[PDB]
């Protein structure tokens, strides 16, 4: 029965929500270090016609 | 530590009594007024280390 089993099983969303938030947090960190994106001597490449960044 | 309340407010709670050459009553000079005045004017605004050297 909805609105009754929720009061007992709302706990089961905490860990998956933590997982999604952790993935989102990881993505944010990546943006900060883009100082050498497409600038390394090994992977220096010319952009595609509809490409803005080589990686995200 | 030292909280310079006097300098913040411009109060002069105890600075009047710190040196010989600071506004004595009836303009009575200290025995070593000139030497103290010269030393203070030499050391002013320079810092303790440079003043000592």
């Amino acid at each position: 029965n909805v609105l009754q089993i929720v009061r007992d099983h709302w706990v089961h969303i905490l860990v998956p929500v933590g997982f999604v938030f952790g993935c989102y947090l990881d993505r944010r960190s990546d943006e900060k270090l883009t100082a050498f994106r497409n600038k390394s001597l090994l992977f220096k490449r010319e952009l595609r016609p509809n490409e803005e960044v080589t990686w995200k | 530590p030292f909280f310079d309340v006097q300098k913040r407010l411009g109060l002069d709670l105890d600075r009047w009594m710190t040196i010989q050459s600071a506004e004595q009553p009836h303009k009575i000079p200290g025995r070593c007024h000139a030497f103290e005045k010269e030393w203070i004017e030499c050391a002013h605004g320079i810092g303790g280390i440079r003043a000592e050297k």
Binding site: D30, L33, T34, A35, F36, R37, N38, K39, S40, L42, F43, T54, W55, K56 | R15, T18, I19, S21, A22, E23, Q24, H26, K27, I28, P29, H33, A34, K37, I40, E41, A43, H44, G45, I46, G47, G48, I49, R50, A51, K53
Partner: protein, 70 residues
């Protein structure tokens, strides 16, 4: 399929490592420079740091003192 839906390419990690290494090397150089600057300032006293107070010269009274020789 696993590589496509779970991972990125080598260049991402490569260039992130380059950026991280640059940041850390700059920080190490700055730490060494700060230690040397602190040593010089404390030894000489000619910098903004380690300034120890001297008597304010605005406290001196410049008036005739009932005696000609001060």
């Amino acid at each position: 399929w696993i590589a496509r839906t779970f991972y990125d390419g080598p260049e991402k990690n490569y260039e992130k490592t380059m950026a991280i290494l640059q940041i850390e090397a700059e920080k190490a150089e700055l730490r060494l420079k700060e230690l040397e600057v602190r040593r010089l300032m404390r030894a000489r006293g000619d910098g903004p740091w380690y300034q120890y107070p001297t008597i304010d010269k605005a406290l001196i009274d410049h008036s005739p003192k009932t005696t000609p020789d001060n």
